[PDB]
């Protein structure tokens, strides 16, 4: 298992060695912790912000690829909690 | 007489700067240049608390006031100039005659008119008068104010000295006087803005509940302000006039019936207030009612509407052209007013007011008149820009506010954005503002700090303080809403009100109210209408737009609910608590909140006990009068204190040691002399002003400080021994204190601004701006650097670092203190401390790093809990808080202490125990193997001798010499001395090896940086840029050969590196570097070797951690602490265990495993098992390692079968081994000095310096620098020559067998790392690639070939794989690095054992500073620098043994126990050095680099000579601090360390209490009270002598210094009480008087000779009468040195012929035979290579001699 995390507006970079390809294990766009991605008091107001389609979006964009770049924002993901400063948290593997 | 248009006096007043500067290390540098202050210290045993002396905390340190009253041009009619100075009741008066550039400097003794001491800060009133020839009776006067520093408070009362941790607060002046010498003038910090009345909401017109507390009390419209004689603030709150009492309570005193709620913000209904200073009467003037009123009762009666009485006006508005002149000449009550505006009341009680366009008077009798008489348009002349005209010539257009100057008694008028002054003599002049008369091009130079040259933008109000300071309110009502200050000198600056981005009147979504309870310059005001100055100097603002009254106050500590004062030091992370009298109660941690120090006093408030957090109490035992007797240390040790009759601390001593001996200059308190236990006496000289002028040392070195006090204060710093002249220029203004540090043409600028900003503009081009903010915990009283904006001279050179502080309060008490580090709006790290659970959480913003540090009940960190399942680190402490033990999983190291606090035992987790026994200054260290080391010490804990288990005794000594401190190490039973000569500042000057005569000379230039290195016939020069001061060139010159390294820099960063050679065949190199935008990160490296461009290597990083994500063609992946290096072809996986040690390496190529290694360790971290598979189909080999009782490698087994055996001497010398692959056991032999003599049957030869000389037939030639220049074997027919650069790195390798390689160092972070190799036989370049641990893993050729290297745990290459994944080379090494198997010997590998450069001919592995012998298993030379710290840290040691005879494991150090945040971060791949500019990079060196190499990297860092440079460094270091508290990771006792003193001090010739100075080769001596009679005899003889500069030599082991005296020895012979022979003094010093006869170049000469000698130090004096005496002695000493150089060179040449070794010159069979029989060769003579005329220090050097015939 490999881990990547990026705050809102920043890209997440996934890379596999040689000919190995990405396989998405888990993904979430939102907020599950009060300490991750520091901002105004309004950031820590919601630790139960989940996007069910985050796994589907990451799977479609990154699976079977040597590398993947995804921006943590409104251009790629819907908003599961407007007003709360979000982040994209992903767990993945490199398979043949 | 009438003086109109006459030149007014414009004096320039310069006050002596405040003592704000102190030293970071008073023991290293006691001189504070800017304030000419001496900052000294005395370290006491048993405590970390020091005794501090600051020369500014004395009576002798006077206050200065330079008054320049006249310039180069003098007015025509001027005849006399008068001066008046008023300070604390004193009145100095002096008359002078008119002269160009006339100036006087006033000296204040810091006393009042009653002769009593004045403490804190005082105000001086300077009056300058101009008497003209036209009128001798009248004098034109001008009053100006200046700030003078008074007496500083003495907290500790220890004879002028203070306790390091003991502070005091001056409550009246607002000054924090710290015991360490730090002074914090709190009132000089940024001004604070607060709301004293109003809440931003309007009250009802009826004023219900208006009589209560001022704070938060609703206002309607504050249009006028006036301060009463009581200190009360009268508020013109539109409808009502409300009085704010000093008790902070409000009561309505007068109601105005003509005011309606609708007209609140109407300018027509605006009225003006004024307080009469005579009687506290309040005058009201309403423009709308056309009258002036006086408040009857200031307490407020029942009927408030009728509490006023008419002073002037009837109520009717009179026409502009009135016949009766609106009632002028008669009673004011009966008169009529046009429109009364601003009112001001004179000192005499005279009332002045603005009436439409004129100024009218109302005298004591009640008669109205006109001061500025209008309607006289004919006599009116337009406003003169320079000259001052009478009231009659002045016309006023739209005048508003009016105020009296309480210092001048002059009237100030605010008229159409121009402030004018009406003097008592009725003279009018422009004070502030630029009229249209001389707008453009009135001033060609444009911008200046003067008020006359600065235009006023919509001014509304004016106020004048008692110090004559004018405050101007400016309101545009849109964006301009500010308060400006005009000082007595005429300078204008912003005091309050930042430029608002938003429109206050037009924009609806706007908030023009901010900055309250913060700094004034940052605050945003809204429509300021009126101003008033409080008695304490605070400025009140009628902030009409925000319906509030705001106060701009001096930054001061406020009395809390507990009747206590609080101040803090964020840099030291401390909070100081003082009582109501400013007496130091406690010192708490600013982070932890735990008590660090508790102070208890006597009945007379004299400090008697300092109790630390650990329970260590330092008691001050005192007399009934408060006089100190002694100090009772925490270990119950008595430190005797003797205070002299002058009140100065005379003696500080223990029962054995004399820690300090001092003498003072009379009753001034100025420290004259200071002596220690060694007898080293420092002499201090001051001027009559008490400013430090000279510092003389026993070395003869004098540091001089010269002050030139003009418009700018310049301090010149000079040294008698160096050409490093430093000059500091100080320019003090209203906005900032400007400093310029000049070294030749290299200028560094420093700016300390009033807003709290510190700006540095380095000569290199880089600028740093530190910005202050009030502390989140301590408040406005302590400004903190929370922002740092960096600028580099490049395209995208703007960088920004930020510290965001926060707090969590539960029930009014601090629970959590958070700190977040940010770079360009991104959080990198957060350090939060939770006081409730005592944990310090350090965490990343992306779940990558998490560390928790647990603190005990005493507030000490004891447990480090890391993430990723890593082994936790825990520590033990003794009762006194000293570190007892350390533990990291299974690894532990504990100690036991004495009742005296000395380590008696050392326990390891494997059961190993070391015992420490103390017996009469000697310590015996015994190991369980019964190996014994005896360390003999001084009273000062400095080594005298070291006895090894072999019973061989090594001896050491240190002595003060002429211009330096000499450190001598003598090997067992040998005279072959190893000497390290250091300057007074601790810089290396000379390294000498007396055995063969090896010498390395270090010279320092004009920038106080390394300029030259001279050894043998080689000269290395360091060139610096004349303007930027950066290192531009490094050139090595050895005869014909020249090696030049040139640099180009972007600020302090290298962007270009050039390599140039003078040799025929040698190729040149160029490396171009680029940096990532808005960072200090290297983005690319572009090499060009032999004019052949190579591919660019790109570098990619993680912006949050600094982790290298991509380098060249390689990509890096990080997971926990493990790393993966990937390519489309290869994957290199590195796995680390819980202790951060490598456990598995995996090298895959084309998805196939090429190499894998597994390392296993014991409890102590020693390698016990290693499994290796070299190749995809090869078998796996298991290696098992066993260690002896001392952790020395005993045996190595291959697949559980014993193959190698190792045995050791009592000294740790490897005396038994199985060489290479052999089963045969070979013995090694050693002499008394631990030098190898035999390896089996092969004899070894090590010279008298400790360097490898021969191994059988192999001959090795090491230079003075310790570098192998040549190696050959005549029998085997091979020869190898090496070339080195100026930084001590190997540049080339050339053999007689065709081999020729060149080495290049392109890595700026790893300067000793070989990155490129040029091969001359095929002309191809090899690029070397290293992993994150520094091990070689890949290679790339310029031909297109790619190689993949398999390296072990030590960085040793074991296998090479081709571009097609095929193993082409496989190597097998023994534990000590000897190759026994090589599958392909033709494939030449540059890097060998332990990552060094291996040579297959010599069998040596090269590391930049040392060479390692693979056959013997030891180094080829000793590291003599080991002797410097072996005394402080005693342990088993050997000068030659490799890695403590454990070659496969990482060297055991206390750094293995991770107890600091920066070290934990490094493990996780984090590189803070890449994200935080200036942050120290973690050193990746096996062998320490040479002095010049480490110096070339650190020279770009800012210098620390001056006080402003040290202030800047404190700002930088405090900004880079991570943990709130750092532990002292030391399992050894603290030793008092002196600069350049390594060993036990020898009795000096220049005795204690004797002054010795050598200025321009001339000797001067002085005598103090403590000096003995025999020491005074030496001083008397040495006085007026001339020293032979650069002509001092080491002759027969003696440190000889030559001197000359012009005259007769008769006078000096009477002093010595001898005629001839040798005499022994009380000190033991030998005095030898003789009359030698010398034959120098055919000339015979006889003279008297007096010689002073103690041990190796020899001082020689020659007597003569002629002027040529100095020139004759110079010619004599050089001829005698030439004889020594020639004698030695011919002897060495004869020995080379005898040994069968190659000589310096090619001799024929006849020439060689002549040399063997006679010793000399006919026709041949020795000549100097480096000229003796430029290099007199190499006059006796045989290595600087070449044999040549007369043919040349
Ligand atoms: C600075 O620059 C210098 C150049 O100016 C440079 O010096 C040169 O370095 C290269 C590389 O090391 C040297 O080349 C080597 O020469 C070896 C010597 O072999 C000679 O002798 C044999 C008879 O005894 C001849 O058969 C052989 O002929 C071959 O080469 C001819 C070219 O001259 C060619 O015309 C022929 O057709 C024929 O092919 C030759 O005259 C040579 O053995 C060596 O080859 C091995 O190494 C290569 C990689 O370096 C491999 O690609 C290659 O396959 C070889 O590996 C095999 O041998 C190794 C050693 O025994 C084993 O470790 C390998 O596992 C492998 O063994 C297998 O294959 C064998 C058959 O191929 C078989 O017998 C085994 O059983 C096993 O199955 C290589 O070509 C060159 O001589 C140097 N040049 C000069 C002018 O000095 C210097 O190093 C540079 N310095 C630095 C610091 O960079
Ligand atoms: C680090 O913590 C360990 C506990 O994990 C300490 O080990 C204990 O030490 C005492 C002696 O003071 C022994 O009696 C116990 O048996 C040990 N506890 C156990 C069960 O592990 C250790 O002393 C600490 N290390 C240091 C040097 O402070
Ligand atoms: C170390 O001791 C040796 C021997 O005492 C010194 O060498 C002698 O020096 C004198 C004077 O220069 C010569 O006349 C002798 O011929 C030398 N003796 C021999 C045979 O070596 C040497 O100078 C001393 N060196 C130091 C560093 O003091
Ligand atoms: C003063 O001079 C005497 C005589 O030259 C020195 O004493 C000699 O020192 C050497 C070396 O320690 C001894 O081997 C001799 O036995 C001593 N000779 C005599 C005759 O006393 C003495 O060391 C000198 N003083 C100092 C402190 O350097
Ligand atoms: C100040 O005003 C309060 C009402 O707000 C009143 O209770 C108190 O007595 C007054 N205190 C003084 C200073 O007299």
Residue numbers in the entry:
A (entry chain D): 7 to 102
B (entry chain A): 1047 to 2798
Question: What does the original paper state about this entry?
Answer:
Teneurins are ancient metazoan cell adhesion receptors that control brain development and neuronal wiring in higher animals. Here, we present crystal structures of Teneurin-Latrophilin complexes that reveal how the lectin and olfactomedin domains of Latrophilin bind across a spiraling beta-barrel domain of Teneurin, the YD shell.
We produced murine Latrophilin 2 (Lphn2 Lec domain, residues 30–137) and chicken Teneurin 2 (residues 1,043–2,802) individually in HEK293 cells and mixed the purified proteins. The data reveal the Lphn2 Lec binding site on the Teneurin YD shell, spanning the tiers of the spiraling YD shell domain and burying a total of ∼1,500 Å2 surface area. A 500-ns unrestrained simulation of the complex showed little movement between the Lec and YD shell (root-mean-square deviation [RMSD], ∼0.2 nm), suggestive of a stable complex. In contrast, the NHL domain drifted from its original position at the YD shell (RMSD, ∼1.2 nm), suggesting that it is connected via a flexible hinge. The results suggested two binding hotspots within the interface; one of these contacts is centered around D55, located in the loop between Lphn2 Lec strands β2 and β3. A second contact is formed by the β1-β2 and β4-h1 loops of Lec, which are binding to the lower part of the Ten2 YD shell. In both structures, the C-terminal Tox-GHH/TCAP domain lies ∼6 nm away from the Latrophilin binding site.
